[PDB]
Amino acid sequence: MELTPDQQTLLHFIMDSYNKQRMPQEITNKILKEAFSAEENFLILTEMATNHVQVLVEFTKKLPGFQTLDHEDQIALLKGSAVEAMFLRSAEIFNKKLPSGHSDLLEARIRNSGISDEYITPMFSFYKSIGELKMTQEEYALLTAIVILSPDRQYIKDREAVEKLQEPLLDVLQKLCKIHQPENPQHFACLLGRLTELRTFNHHHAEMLMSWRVNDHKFTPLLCEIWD
């Protein structure tokens, strides 16, 4: 029925940090000006990807309790959650942050950057599937924190410490569903569906990067070596 004062505090801290994330206008304006070529389209996606990485780290550092974790575990979580958090934020940018005209041109650019349909089709399918949920800013922020604070990432030394940080967030999210959608008890279940849908991108993204060869314009060592 109501969030406890402690849950309200946790939500406020997540919301404040999430609302501060921004994709700069300098990047967004390039979508309407740059040449419509595979090389220029991919350069825009490179700029977006680097902004996604910087935003992910700044959001993560501010997550309540993240600073209390073992330093190596902090890195393991960032590395492990990077793809999922990037795909989740890219869905928010595409569906909510960009005006219709910018999103139509961004899609045009994504589809003409020389990337195989094998990786482009699941991306727009995910954007549509998440778009159906009409997710609030609170749901986007909590889902992002939940993805980042996943205790089953590779090479975490103290998983129980991560579990203690992730569990209050899942509790707040389910309570928010009960408060905002009391007639729809399957709403939290629908949000969980997006978590597993996000997990499938771990392999799709890794296969995508491996499909681009060293001499190709798409090979971007700054981003690709985060996973190599």
């Binding site: 780290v57 550092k61 890195i75 990077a82 985060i226």
Partner: peptide, 11 residues
């Protein structure tokens, strides 16, 4: 490792 380590540890 390099990039994620720098971004986390910087102020």
């Amino acid at each position: 490792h390099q990039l994620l380590r720098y971004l986390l540890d910087k102020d």
